[PDB]
């Protein structure tokens, strides 16, 4: 069952993301795949990966909708695509 992604740390240049997989299944499956990008433009994924439950995506573009998705490393399913906006 895919992780659930939500935001608590928006900024002008910073978008800080958080996910919360349920504890029963917390088999701590390696790392978490945070697959972010811009919108329909500059394609540099700049994807970051971490085993924790939250990431602080830095050096982001102001007043831009970045597209984000979190995937369980799968060493099996990824989360739904999410759209967040900088400040």
């Amino acid at each position, epitope marked *: 069952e895919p992780p659930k992604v939500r935001l608590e740390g928006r900024s002008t240049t910073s978008l800080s993301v958080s996910w919360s997989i349920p504890p029963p299944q917390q088999s701590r499956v390696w790392k978490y*795949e945070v*697959t972010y*990008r811009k919108k*329909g*433009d*500059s*394609n*540099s*994924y*700049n*994807v970051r*990966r971490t085993e924790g439950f939250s990431v602080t995506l830095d050096d982001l*573009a102001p007043d831009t909708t970045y597209l984000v*998705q979190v*995937q369980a*490393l*799968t*060493q099996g399913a*990824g989360s739904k695509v999410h759209e967040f906006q900088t400040l």
Partner: antibody, heavy 129, light 106 residues
Framework: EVQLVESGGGLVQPGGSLRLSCAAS????????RHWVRQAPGKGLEWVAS????????SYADSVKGRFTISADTSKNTAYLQMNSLRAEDTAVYYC??????????????????????WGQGTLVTVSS | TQSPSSLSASVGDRVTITCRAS??????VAWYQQKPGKAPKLLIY???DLYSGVPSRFSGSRSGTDFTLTISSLQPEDFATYYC???????????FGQGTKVEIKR
């Protein structure tokens, strides 16, 4: 820092075999895809193939399709380009290059892949009689 | 495929390099600076795109079935050859541009 030291090369004859090998220090392999591209002397670049070391997803080019075989080993932190059925055109300096990550990235949104951030150095590969 | 293959300008002259695309969908645009006799080097990914302390220098956008890399204030180092690279959404293949070269107008 991070490098993509390649190896192999030398000389082999047409209808020959030369297995190319590209080591990789510094960067955590498996995620950063390994790419083979040829720079034929005098002319420009020609992409050979690409593969995702951890998951091992094969991607070849029509120019070399079937002739070669790409592979890698996460433990060895190294990639492999098997060159078989060499033909005259195959003469080139072969280049090793690293790409991005994200299983989602490679799948679904592939056309939005970042460029070859880290390259290799080149080793002469001459196929002549 | 690039519409220019060999060009010439002078120091400081704003230049425009082009490269034909496959269209499909708005896709990736990575250019490389292959200094003659060295190895291809990526400029950088910085939104406006550059190779320095977040400058403009090598800046690009998209124009039709082609893409551009117009640099404003040409400096000596930049003189090299440049290739446009994309990622097709077919068999995860990688196309390449023909290759453009820059010469010092003397």
């Amino acid at each position: 820092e991070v490098q993509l030291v390649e190896s192999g090369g030398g000389l082999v004859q047409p209808g020959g075999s030369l297995r190319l090998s590209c080591a990789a220090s510094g960067f955590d392999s498996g995620a950063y895809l390994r790419h083979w591209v040829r720079q034929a002397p005098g002319k420009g670049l020609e992409w050979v193939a690409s593969i995702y070391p951890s998951y091992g997803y094969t991607s070849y080019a029509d120019s070399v399709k079937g002739r070669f075989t790409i592979s890698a080993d996460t433990s060895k932190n190294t990639a492999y380009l098997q060159m078989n059925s060499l033909r005259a055109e195959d003469t080139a300096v072969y280049y090793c290059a690293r790409s991005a990550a994200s299983y989602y990235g490679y799948w679904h949104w592939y056309h939005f892949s970042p460029g070859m951030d880290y390259w290799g150095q080149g080793t002469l590969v001459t196929v002549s009689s | 495929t690039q519409s220019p293959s060999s060009l010439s300008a002078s120091v400081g002259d704003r230049v425009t390099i082009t490269c034909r695309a496959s269209q499909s969908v708005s896709s990736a645009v990575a250019w490389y600076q292959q200094k003659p006799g060295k190895a291809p080097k990526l400029l950088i990914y910085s939104a406006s795109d550059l190779y320095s302390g977040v400058p403009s220098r090598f800046s690009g956008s998209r124009s039709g079935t082609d893409f551009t890399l117009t640099i404003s204030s040409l400096q000596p180092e930049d003189f090299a050859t440049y290739y446009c690279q994309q990622y097709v959404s077919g068999g995860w293949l990688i196309t390449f541009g023909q290759g453009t070269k820059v010469e010092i107008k003397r």
